[PDB]
Amino acid sequence: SEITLGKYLFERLKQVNVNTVFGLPGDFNLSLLDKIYEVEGMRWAGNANELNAAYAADGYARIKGMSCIITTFGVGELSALNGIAGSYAEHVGVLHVVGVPSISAQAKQLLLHHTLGNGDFTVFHRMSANISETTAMITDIATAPAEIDRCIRTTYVTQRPVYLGLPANLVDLNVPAKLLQTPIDMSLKPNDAESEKEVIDTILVLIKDAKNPVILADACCSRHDVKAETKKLIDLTQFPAFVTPMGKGSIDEQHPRYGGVYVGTLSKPEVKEAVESADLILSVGALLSDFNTGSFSYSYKTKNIVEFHSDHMKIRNATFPGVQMKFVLQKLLTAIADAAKGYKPVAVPARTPANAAVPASTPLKQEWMWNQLGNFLQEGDVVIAETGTSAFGINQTTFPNNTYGISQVLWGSIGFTTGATLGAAFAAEEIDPKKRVILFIGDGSLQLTVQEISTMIRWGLKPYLFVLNNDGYTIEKLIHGPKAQYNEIQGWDHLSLLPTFGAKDYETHRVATTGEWDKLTQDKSFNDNSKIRMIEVMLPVFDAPQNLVEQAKLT
Amino acid sequence: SEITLGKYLFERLKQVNVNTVFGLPGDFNLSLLDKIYEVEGMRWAGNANELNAAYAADGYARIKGMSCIITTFGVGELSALNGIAGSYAEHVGVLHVVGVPSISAQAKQLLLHHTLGNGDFTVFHRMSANISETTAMITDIATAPAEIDRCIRTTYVTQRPVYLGLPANLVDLNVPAKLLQTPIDMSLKPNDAESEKEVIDTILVLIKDAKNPVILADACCSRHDVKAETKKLIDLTQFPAFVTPMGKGSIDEQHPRYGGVYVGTLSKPEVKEAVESADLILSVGALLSDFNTGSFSYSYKTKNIVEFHSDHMKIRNATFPGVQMKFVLQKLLTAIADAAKGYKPVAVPARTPANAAVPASTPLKQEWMWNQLGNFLQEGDVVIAETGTSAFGINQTTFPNNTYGISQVLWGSIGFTTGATLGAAFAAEEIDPKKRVILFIGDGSLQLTVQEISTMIRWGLKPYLFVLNNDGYTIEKLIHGPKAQYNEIQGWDHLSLLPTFGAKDYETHRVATTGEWDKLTQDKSFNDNSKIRMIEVMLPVFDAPQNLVEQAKLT
Amino acid sequence: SEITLGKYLFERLKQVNVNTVFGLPGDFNLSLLDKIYEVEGMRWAGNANELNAAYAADGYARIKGMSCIITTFGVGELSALNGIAGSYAEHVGVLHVVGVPSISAQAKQLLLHHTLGNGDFTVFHRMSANISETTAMITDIATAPAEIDRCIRTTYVTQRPVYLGLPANLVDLNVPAKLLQTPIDMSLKPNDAESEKEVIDTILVLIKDAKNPVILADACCSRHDVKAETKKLIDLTQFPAFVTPMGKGSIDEQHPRYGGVYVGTLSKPEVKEAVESADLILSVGALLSDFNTGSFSYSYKTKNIVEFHSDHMKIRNATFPGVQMKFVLQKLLTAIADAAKGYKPVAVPARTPANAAVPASTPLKQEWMWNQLGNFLQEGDVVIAETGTSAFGINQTTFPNNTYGISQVLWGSIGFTTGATLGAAFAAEEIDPKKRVILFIGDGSLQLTVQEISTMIRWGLKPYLFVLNNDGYTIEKLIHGPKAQYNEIQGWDHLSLLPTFGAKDYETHRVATTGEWDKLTQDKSFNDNSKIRMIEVMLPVFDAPQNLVEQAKLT
Amino acid sequence: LKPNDAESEKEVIDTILVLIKDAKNPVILADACCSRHDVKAETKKLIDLTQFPAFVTPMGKGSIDEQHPRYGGVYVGTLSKPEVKEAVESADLILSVGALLSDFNTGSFSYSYKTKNIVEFHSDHMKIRNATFPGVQMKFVLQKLLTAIADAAKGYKPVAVPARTPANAAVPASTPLKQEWMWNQLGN
Numbered sequence A, B, C: 001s002e003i004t005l006g007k008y009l010f011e012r013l014k015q016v017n018v019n020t021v022f023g024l025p026g027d028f029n030l031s032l033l034d035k036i037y038e039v040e041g042m043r044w045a046g047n048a049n050e051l052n053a054a055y056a057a058d059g060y061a062r063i064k065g066m067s068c069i070i071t072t073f074g075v076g077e078l079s080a081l082n083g084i085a086g087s088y089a090e091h092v093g094v095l096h097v098v099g100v101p102s103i104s105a106q107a108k109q110l111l112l113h114h115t116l117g118n119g120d121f122t123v124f125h126r127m128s129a130n131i132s133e134t135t136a137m138i139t140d141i142a143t144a145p146a147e148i149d150r151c152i153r154t155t156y157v158t159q160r161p162v163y164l165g166l167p168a169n170l171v172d173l174n175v176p177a178k179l180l181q182t183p184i185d186m187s188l189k190p191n192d193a194e195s196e197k198e199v200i201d202t203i204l205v206l207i208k209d210a211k212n213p214v215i216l217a218d219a220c221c222s223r224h225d226v227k228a229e230t231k232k233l234i235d236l237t238q239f240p241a242f243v244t245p246m247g248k249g250s251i252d253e254q255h256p257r258y259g260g261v262y263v264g265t266l267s268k269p270e271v272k273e274a275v276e277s278a279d280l281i282l283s284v285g286a287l288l289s290d291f292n293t294g295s296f297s298y299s300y301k302t303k304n305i306v307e308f309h310s311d312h313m314k315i316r317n318a319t320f321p322g323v324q325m326k327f328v329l330q331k332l333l334t335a336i337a338d339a340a341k342g343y344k345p346v347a348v349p350a351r352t353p354a355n356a357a358v359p360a361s362t363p364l365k366q367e368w369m370w371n372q373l374g375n376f377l378q379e380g381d382v383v384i385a386e387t388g389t390s391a392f393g394i395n396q397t398t399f400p401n402n403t404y405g406i407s408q409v410l411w412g413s414i415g416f417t418t419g420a421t422l423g424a425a426f427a428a429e430e431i432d433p434k435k436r437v438i439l440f441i442g443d444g445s446l447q448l449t450v451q452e453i454s455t456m457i458r459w460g461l462k463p464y465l466f467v468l469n470n471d472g473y474t475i476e477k478l479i480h481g482p483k484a485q486y487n488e489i490q491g492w493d494h495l496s497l498l499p500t501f502g503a504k505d506y507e508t509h510r511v512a513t514t515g516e517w518d519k520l521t522q523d524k525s526f527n528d529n530s531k532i533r534m535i536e537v538m539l540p541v542f543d544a545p546q547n548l549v550e551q552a553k554l555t
Numbered sequence D: 001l002k003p004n005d006a007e008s009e010k011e012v013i014d015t016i017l018v019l020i021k022d023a024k025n026p027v028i029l030a031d032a033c034c035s036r037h038d039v040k041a042e043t044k045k046l047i048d049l050t051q052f053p054a055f056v057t058p059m060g061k062g063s064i065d066e067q068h069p070r071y072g073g074v075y076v077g078t079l080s081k082p083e084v085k086e087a088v089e090s091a092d093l094i095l096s097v098g099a100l101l102s103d104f105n106t107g108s109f110s111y112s113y114k115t116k117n118i119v120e121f122h123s124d125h126m127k128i129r130n131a132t133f134p135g136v137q138m139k140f141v142l143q144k145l146l147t148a149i150a151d152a153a154k155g156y157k158p159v160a161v162p163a164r165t166p167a168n169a170a171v172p173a174s175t176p177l178k179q180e181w182m183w184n185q186l187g188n
């Protein structure tokens, strides 16, 4: 028996659990799109924007493991680029598949629509090359499947965007259906014995001489299939554990040895004192390490630190290529037992005290809210916070045990969260329908990717959208141009947005005073993901969380 | 006396009349943007999206001459690439300036934010080089002024996108103000003597041996400072004139020798025969050429063609590089006189009879609407059509004298119009407040960039947004997947769209029956561009321009 | 004043001392070629083969520093690829410049000759990408010079092939001649202080604990501008020094602490015993390190070794990216003094005894000859040996002080030496006209690139060509198929080759017995590079140097 | 080779026949892919059945018997014999067997077919003017064509074809060799 390349792709995707595809129909991808509808349990998001789709695909990847978006030749693929760049930058596995024109034996003299007009049809591919781990422009079905498998394996394995160009005339050719019986190998090859070894010797050597160690969970410790290894390291050692604004969400904040969020100079004096006073640092999932001109001053001089990355090791200045943090962390876990035996637990910074009762009419303030949010969250919630005050605000909330956070800290492209809510809420519906997805986004950013709420309504998703109305680009005004016109926006009837896009079963709320917040977030019918909800929080123009108003002065 | 580079840029942009600047503020252009406000007559669009900003810069360059858009490093600049490419393909003069981190720094590894994380900063600049006539990344004020001038001249002169990289530390340094006393030379140098000559000698011989020549206006005859020469050509020869779907708007359709729009297989038989029976073709502002599409086919019967290009000549198969059309067009008209003396004024096709009084309660159909439109239009209007059924149907409308059209025929990116509308309505305004701008766009494409209506409201612009609600992507359903889910969309409450974005003084209407359209378009108040208006035209799912629904069945 | 891009290229080359250009005239490179003739002291080799030219360019690079070859679009560039791959593989700086078709604003519908016929004109470039350090396909003279400078700087700096595509229409445009006054920066940026530091600490730490150290000069210690640093290391430490078959020629073999040539299992028992018995190895110019399936078994388990590379450091398994061996070796030289103070010189393997008198009629044997050659060589000679018996043979000759050897050990492409003799003898004529260039090549290989001797004659060069006639592909027969027909060749009148190609002032000799060899090589008029000379040595079919007949058994 | 898709090859014929009928001066043009593609029979039959004038491209020279009566010469664009250039360019229909070469310029000359009304026969597909029928291999289509063409070429008027070139006239044995004379004299 045979199966058409078009159907084989989706089949493979279903096998790797990417049950939702993102994008918009168009040139050279219409026939390919018929196929997805042929595979059981596959659905087509039906986005309203190649960008929003690229964003959604990122949120989906972050939650489900990896994702896939299909755009059209030229006009489609170029629109999604920024969303691709972001996924390339923050290590997100996204398979970008574009429907390419038919592959002919002679000059495609007649191809013009959606082209630069200069005859060069490889330009859009060459462009995506810069923000892609690898690219594959298929030409003969003799190995098309092997090539699909490869782009899928590479994406998942290395968690970075992969470009897959597929000519239209091939989506309908047949390939051996048999090929589908051997799953794709999604495993990493074991490390070079002699190096992983060397790496260990050294780390124990370091752990032994160290007197005040501290663990630091970072960006790449969340979606790199290394959650266990990390929970084990914390237990077996019992050293003080801290997260980075990018690592927040990947560590159980209700753990007895959790110190907090290390954001350098924006850290809590106690938190800052702890991390900097350590004589050894075990940074898991390393990717940030230094930030000077922007955000904070978290950079120092790398004082004797070990950096576990997905593919390499970094002890001081020496680098060990190929040595993958997973299998290392494992081999390093067996021997960590003895060397830590007589360790004296170093006191860890206490939790921030909850806000103490205040009259129900006091107007809402960000600092109060980011600290109050901790009471609404519940185990299992996926929280998403947009660049700007929100991004900063979420770093000051104590996460109930087991909560996934999404903050595009390194790339920082506003708008991105709207798309992500769809992709995330999507995956979430797929894993556990009772998993909630809360989103905090400022008024300024909603405008850039606003129409994506339409796609939320059409699928009957039930996410919580908190909109922060501080009338403008506060975060900007704080670093420059407080009253700058380019920092102000057009006023929008935020709430009515839902029904405008067709929301038939929704709820809209407007919180202005502490009282109003508690009553709502405490309602038992509100705590339940029964339907889409837009909650508009009214906040001051120059009100901002503490951590931000501090770096706002120097940067 | 002195002046900051930042202010010098906007002072220069003022001189060539780019009164409006597009884009969004970012972590690297914030300081530059302050200088715009330091120049009388200059404004900041205040876009809600970089892509839309780019679409807008396109529309504006089409009506005003050239334009400028500013984005921020990485995130903002990569968000506008689709727009840019389109401007590159259909030859629009768009300047793309991007705020870049201080290249004149001594720290390399000490700067991480809005990058691929690999340390490579030339990456985004290299990407745009593929769709830019030229680029320039400024490094020292010593020649920063010259570079700016060079970029501005090349944009206007060649009508293609230019990339200008601007490091932050450079916007606040001083340059000799004296420099702005000498304008930027937007003049084209004279062609090489003997070459232009050969071109004439050769064109004349062709005009003589021809027995049925025709003048064909294409995309580059409108905005290239060549309208005089064009009208003189039509007068002196009296040859029949036709326009391509990209040329419609650049030729007075009330002129006696005007024959109609040549859209290949979608033409009126008389028009198809008229053009194909030509033994010589003078193509003014040539761009489009033999090409096929999912919907139709386009191809000139004869090969005996003389293509007039902004920078060169194409006679049959020979190419005379550097021999610019405008100056050649002139030398031509001067020696053509005698060889066209005894020319026999070939008959030209007749206009199409305006629909016959149909009962007020008959349901609106596209064919009838495109034909009936001809009446609502008044001299001066700027008509914009969106890719899809609209783009195909605006060719069957008879244009009053002096009516310009904007149809992204070649690049064909849906969504483009909502943005181009704002930029176009802007330039119009600055040129003449009473000049109207009408836009027809399907219900589907609106979803991609809907939020740019926001920027329209904030500026109190008064355009006409005709939205064609035919429930889904009909143009697509016509070439494939008639009931395919990917061709369906989420129902939107189109009318309440204006109010949601804060419109206070607007006006919404819904036209369903032929009478309702007559009553509405014949109203004198409606005929007055007093306020932004939205008209929702309820149309049937598979309805489309007759000729189109005819070739969609054959192909 | 201005200068044409075409002339600017050659000008820049002259500045970097590449006084000879390689290649053959053709499409899109004819006008560019006129330019070289415009620059003083520049000459055009005038090759007879894009391959031979690519080979010659490699020999030239090896001797002069870097080189440059110009081929034609399609048919030319693809022929030189193998010679490029080789230069990429063995770290040779070669600038490949191909004359590309004119860059047009629209589709080059009419370009066909020298194309795959499918319209795709980037294919040949994409292909060369795999064996190129970097590539540059120039499009606008706005920065063409900066791009030329870059490809030239990259080539020289990193000593690897660089692809430079140059459209024909640009070779004749003008660029600011001023630009030529600022030489290109050919210096390496200093190393990261904190790492180069770490690297040092460790190396002394290692040198201190070491009891039996040995220096090992390798491939990249000859043309990496690190000759001094290396001569100093040997003196200051006084450790035993050895070379690899690829390093041979880069170390003064008449030095008191020279151990010999380490080829693993093919080494001299004493030599093998020394290197393997060391407890520390300082491999300078590292690039080989391990060879198992082929040549020899030189691979072991990397027992505590330090590898100095042009761009990185390798101590054990740890790697230090960016740390360049030069500046390191320097910083490591200042501190090496004290730690070596009380070192006890470890005895070094003696020289192989010269052959003891044998009757003048004894027939020639390779072992006897490779050992006898040492008496003919003189200080300053550039010796070249081809893959096969020769390659192996040269490893057993004691090099008079200061002699450069050329043996393509890693890539090993027969034929390559013929071209190299031209390129090498060329450069040699340029630096010191009295420098001799001896070439040893087998009968089998001469056939592959034979016509290149023509180019030697036309320039009046005076190299010594020793042809080894053992009637076949001996080296092959030894590893497999002793009597295999594919291992035999067609008989050629070798000597007459010179006059056949036009040699008017030459000498041909045929050595068959030891006697004959001594008489000739000892003549005082023969020791002088007065004219081209072909010496045909008659040797047995299965005669081979010792070192080879040993590994010939296992591989 | 497997048989072409039924209805497609069909459409191709229907369309080619209609073109052969409306033409008033068709020509057969042998290109690079008519020689080594197992299509020589079909080619000769085409020349016989229609009697249309036949010409070869510089890549087709060799695949057509140059002694045949309907043979007109080599079409090398601007390097052709005026009669040949005019003969080909005056064609209102062109049957290109084994098409490969197409409008192209070179440092030495120019090459371009006057008309666009061309039916290109390719090893794996059909090119009628601007439409491309993928997968419809020429050899089998060429056959179905010859079978239905018979009648529409019944009253065809055998257009005149250019005459061969006269072999050099006895020149004194001591005259210095020149290329033009040699290429012509080679013929013998």
Ligand SMILES: Cc1ncc(C[n+]2csc(CCOP(=O)(O)OP(=O)(O)O)c2C)c(N)n1
Binding pocket: A387, A388, A389, A390, A412, A413, A414, A441, A442, A443, A444, A445, A446, A468, A470, A472, A473, A474, A475, A476, B024, B025, B026, B027, B050, B072, B075, B076, B079
């Ligand atoms: C694509 C893109 N363009 C521009 C920016 C620069 N930027 C950063 S924050 C911001 C405004 C976000 O304002 P809002 O949602 O109002 O946030 P808050 O006021 O809550 O901080 C802008 C325009 C960006 N990150 N990405």
Ligand SMILES: Cc1ncc(C[n+]2csc(CCOP(=O)(O)OP(=O)(O)O)c2C)c(N)n1
Binding pocket: A024, A025, A026, A027, A050, A072, A075, A076, A079, B386, B387, B388, B389, B390, B412, B413, B414, B415, B441, B442, B443, B444, B445, B446, B468, B470, B472, B473, B474, B475, B476
């Ligand atoms: C950016 C972009 N994405 C996708 C497409 C493919 N496409 C072409 S037309 C079309 C639908 C436009 O629909 P609508 O405005 O409803 O069209 P109508 O029904 O009037 O044809 C789509 C998705 C494109 N041209 N550009």
Ligand SMILES: Cc1ncc(C[n+]2csc(CCOP(=O)(O)OP(=O)(O)O)c2C)c(N)n1
Binding pocket: C387, C388, C389, C390, C412, C413, C414, C441, C442, C443, C444, C445, C446, C468, C470, C472, C473, C474, C475, C476
């Ligand atoms: C391009 C290329 N093709 C094939 C070979 C394989 N090869 C290695 S040695 C050899 C023969 C060289 O023989 P000769 O010059 O006779 O050497 P000798 O007999 O002196 O060893 C061949 C064909 C090669 N190295 N490179």
Ligand SMILES: [Mg+2]
Binding pocket: A442, A443, A444, A468, A469, A470, A471, A472, A473, A474, A475
């Ligand atoms: Mg705000």
Ligand SMILES: [Mg+2]
Binding pocket: B442, B443, B444, B468, B469, B470, B471, B472, B473, B474, B475
């Ligand atoms: Mg529609």
Ligand SMILES: [Mg+2]
Binding pocket: C442, C443, C444, C468, C469, C470, C471, C472, C473, C474, C475
């Ligand atoms: Mg031999």
